[PDB]
Amino acid sequence: PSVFLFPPKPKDTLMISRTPEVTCVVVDVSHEDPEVKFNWYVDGVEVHNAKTKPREEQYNSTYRVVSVLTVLHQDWLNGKEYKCKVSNKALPAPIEKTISKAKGQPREPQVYTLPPSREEMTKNQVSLTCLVKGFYPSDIAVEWESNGQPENNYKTTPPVLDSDGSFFLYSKLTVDKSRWQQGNVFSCSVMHEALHNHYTQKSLSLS
Amino acid sequence: GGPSVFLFPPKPKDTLMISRTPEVTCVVVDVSHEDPEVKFNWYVDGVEVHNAKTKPREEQYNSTYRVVSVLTVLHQDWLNGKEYKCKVSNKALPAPIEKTISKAKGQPREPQVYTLPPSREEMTKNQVSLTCLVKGFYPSDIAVEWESNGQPENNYKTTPPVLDSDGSFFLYSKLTVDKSRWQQGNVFSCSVMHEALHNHYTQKSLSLS
Ligand SMILES: *[C@@H]1O[C@H](CO[C@@H]2O[C@@H](C)[C@@H](O)[C@@H](O)[C@@H]2O)[C@@H](O[C@@H]2O[C@H](CO)[C@@H](O[C@@H]3O[C@H](CO[C@H]4O[C@H](CO)[C@@H](O)[C@H](O)[C@@H]4O[C@@H]4O[C@H](CO)[C@@H](O[C@@H]5O[C@H](CO[C@]6(C(=O)O)C[C@H](O)[C@@H](NC(C)=O)[C@H]([C@H](O)[C@H](O)CO)O6)[C@H](O)[C@H](O)[C@H]5O)[C@H](O)[C@H]4NC(C)=O)[C@@H](O)[C@H](O[C@H]4O[C@H](CO)[C@@H](O)[C@H](O)[C@@H]4O[C@@H]4O[C@H](CO)[C@@H](O)[C@H](O)[C@H]4NC(C)=O)[C@@H]3O)[C@H](O)[C@H]2NC(C)=O)[C@H](O)[C@H]1NC(C)=O
Ligand SMILES: *[C@@H]1O[C@H](CO[C@@H]2O[C@@H](C)[C@@H](O)[C@@H](O)[C@@H]2O)[C@@H](O[C@@H]2O[C@H](CO)[C@@H](O[C@@H]3O[C@H](CO[C@H]4O[C@H](CO)[C@@H](O)[C@H](O)[C@@H]4O[C@@H]4O[C@H](CO)[C@@H](O[C@@H]5O[C@H](CO)[C@H](O)[C@H](O)[C@H]5O)[C@H](O)[C@H]4NC(C)=O)[C@@H](O)[C@H](O[C@H]4O[C@H](CO)[C@@H](O)[C@H](O)[C@@H]4O[C@@H]4O[C@H](CO)[C@@H](O[C@@H]5O[C@H](CO)[C@H](O)[C@H](O)[C@H]5O)[C@H](O)[C@H]4NC(C)=O)[C@@H]3O)[C@H](O)[C@H]2NC(C)=O)[C@H](O)[C@H]1NC(C)=O
Ligand SMILES: [Cl-]
Numbered sequence: 226p227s228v229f230l231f232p233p234k235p236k237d238t239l240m241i242s243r244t245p246e247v248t249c250v251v252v253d254v255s256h257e258d259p260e261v262k263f264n265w266y267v268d269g270v271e272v273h274n275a276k277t278k279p280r281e282e283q284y285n286s287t288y289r290v291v292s293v294l295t296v297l298h299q300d301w302l303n304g305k306e307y308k309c310k311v312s313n314k315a316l317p318a319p320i321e322k323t324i325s326k327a328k329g330q331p332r333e334p335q336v337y338t339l340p341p342s343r344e345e346m347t348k349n350q351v352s353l354t355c356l357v358k359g360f361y362p363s364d365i366a367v368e369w370e371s372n373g374q375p376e377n378n379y380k381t382t383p384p385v386l387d388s389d390g391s392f393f394l395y396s397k398l399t400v401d402k403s404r405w406q407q408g409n410v411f412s413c414s415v416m417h418e419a420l421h422n423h424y425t426q427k428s429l430s431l432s
Numbered sequence: 433g434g435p436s437v438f439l440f441p442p443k444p445k446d447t448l449m450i451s452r453t454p455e456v457t458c459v460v461v462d463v464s465h466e467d468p469e470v471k472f473n474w475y476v477d478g479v480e481v482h483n484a485k486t487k488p489r490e491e492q493y494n495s496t497y498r499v500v501s502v503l504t505v506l507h508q509d510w511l512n513g514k515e516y517k518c519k520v521s522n523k524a525l526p527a528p529i530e531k532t533i534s535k536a537k538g539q540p541r542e543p544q545v546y547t548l549p550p551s552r553e554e555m556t557k558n559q560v561s562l563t564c565l566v567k568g569f570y571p572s573d574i575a576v577e578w579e580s581n582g583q584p585e586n587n588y589k590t591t592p593p594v595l596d597s598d599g600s601f602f603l604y605s606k607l608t609v610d611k612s613r614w615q616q617g618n619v620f621s622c623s624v625m626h627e628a629l630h631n632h633y634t635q636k637s638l639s640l641s
């Protein structure tokens with residue numbers, strides 16, 4: 226059997242009202258040795274409050290069993306290490322995977338808005354650009370708003386590693402030219418552990 | 433419990449630069465001790481070719497063999513959509529396994545390239561960012577660089593292609609320069625190589641004011 230261990234979603238870690246979870250997944254579990262025992266550790270100390278999910282096997286030969294551990298906000302953000310230890314009779318010894326937040330001094334993103342280029346103005350639809358740079362770790366969420374409303378015609382690049390070891394990305398919002406024209410305000414919001422209140426916002430409007 | 437085959441395309445830049453060597457790579461994993469022998473046959477639009485470079489078997493740390501065969505593809509053949517087939521034979525298989533690969537099938541689309549200058553807020557910094565937006569392209573194979581004067585500017589990073597809502601791709605490239613240099617009206621240029629551009633190449637420029 227094989228073990229994979231997944232982190233929580235960026236927003237879940239940053240918002241006190243949401244529930245950050247770590248997920249331990251076991252695949253390739255045999256019918257002859259189907260029994261699968263999970264032990265979880267938080268910086269080496271065993272915890273007993275994981276919620277094991279029912280096994281679901283479509284469609285190939287084995288089965289994957291997933292155990293979900295809720296993590297404390299402060300613990301994840303302080304870099305504690307979550308260990309999933311999986312025991313099964315088909316293994317030589319128990320398998321152990323360990324996950325945490327990336328290690329090192331957090332760095333605050335700088336956020337800049339850029340308007341469409343002149344050449345793009347000749348088009349029917351235009352692109353509003355949000356540059357987010359200098360952040361560490363790479364865990365981040367970006368969204369767009371207009372008129373106190375979520376704008377959803379955006380796509381965001383994955384984080385890219387910069388030369389100093391920090392990260393950058395860009396988010397592009399697509400809007401009708403005529404709408405950009407007439408001076409509506411559009412906003413780029415960023416959630417990241419190093420921002421004050423884990424949140425900042427920048428705005429962009431026709432000049 | 434048998435061997436598995438994976439077939440990889442060439443790197444985007446290799447397909448676009450005449451001076452580089454585009455290769456297709458056929459990889460076989462989970463080859464046992466009891467049936468260690470793997471045989472490769474390669475086909476280019478169904479016609480067998482005999483000039484792949486096959487490597488010796490290598491024992492992996494998990495106690496199976498990995499065996500790889502590399503076929504060089506002609507630039508024009510890959511770009512014209514020829515289909516490369518790797519057929520793998522091994523005694524532990526019921527029948528030979530076949531994988532086929534070619535360039536992506538959709539309607540090609542020419543990238544639109546736009547340059548964007550630093551934001552005002554960034555101007556207060558020591559170093560500023562020049563941004564190149566490349567969008568609307570298909571397929572995703574592309575290469576981007578920066579120049580100032582004739583010469584290659586090398587303080588840039590580029591995002592991978594991202595899938596847009598219309599099924600085409602976009603990316604951004606960021607060039608980092610000293611504020612004082614941007615100031616004084618130097619020209620910087622963003623160049624893009626893509627199969628759908630005329631001469632597979634276009635260039636845009638950016639300057640202060
Ligand atoms: C048998 O079979 C099996 C199964 O299979 C399947 O099926 C089949 C039939 C077919 O189809 C196939 O295809 C499939 O697959 C199999 O299995 C397999 O296995 C394999 C191997 O063996 C593996 O692999 C691995 O993977 C990984 C990844 O993955 C991912 O992704 C994918 C996609 O594709 C998927 O699928 C998966 O699953 C995953 O996913 C994930 O998951 C997770 C967990 O859970 C998560 O997390 C989480 O999340 C959550 C969420 O939540 C929610 C949401 O969403 O929101 C909530 C809510 O409430 C709800 N909603 C509603 C509305 O309701 C939701 C719900 O629930 C639903 O969803 C809806 O529907 O939910 C939360 O948030 C939490 O908190 C968290 O935690 C996530 O999200 C996901 N994602 C996605 C995208 O999806 C990977 O990773 C890997 O890789 C790695 O490793 C490797 C080796 O191993 C290498 O090579 C690579 O490279 C990597 O590495 C790495 O790297 C890194 C860096 O980068 C580092 O760090 C590390 O360390 C490394 N490592 C090492 C070196 O080692 C691989 O690839 C897989 O997975 C599997 N699959 C599955 C599916 O499972 C088997 O195999 C068979 N057998 C045989 C063949 O023999
Ligand atoms: C044992 O071992 C072995 C080995 O391993 C090793 O060692 C060990 C001991 C350890 O240590 C580890 O860690 C190491 O590694 C193993 O093996 C393995 O196996 C596996 C299986 O199981 C596999 O997997 C696969 O993978 C893939 C990917 O791969 C890649 O990546 C990775 C990371 O991620 C890496 O690792 C690898 O290596 C690879 O890489 C690559 O490579 C290549 C070659 O080399 C390259 O290329 C090249 O390059 C050069 C330079 O250098 C030149 O340039 C040339 O030109 C070229 O060619 C590249 O670059 C690289 N990359 C990177 C680095 O990045 C993946 O993909 C896969 O996946 C798939 O499949 C699966 C199944 O199985 C699934 O599940 C998934 O999902 C997928 O699926 C797919 O999907 C897709 C999409 O998404 C699709 O497609 C589609 O289609 C449609 C139609 O239908 C349309 O067309 C569309 O459009 C499209 O898109 C498809 O369909 C699908 N498919 C299928 C389903 O099939 C997989 O995952 C791996 O790979 C391996 N490894 C190796 C190394 O080999 C074994 O396993 C063991 N065993 C035991 C028992 O344990
Ligand atoms: Cl908490």
Ligand SMILES: [Cl-]
Binds near residue numbers: 506507508
């Ligand atoms: Cl050639």
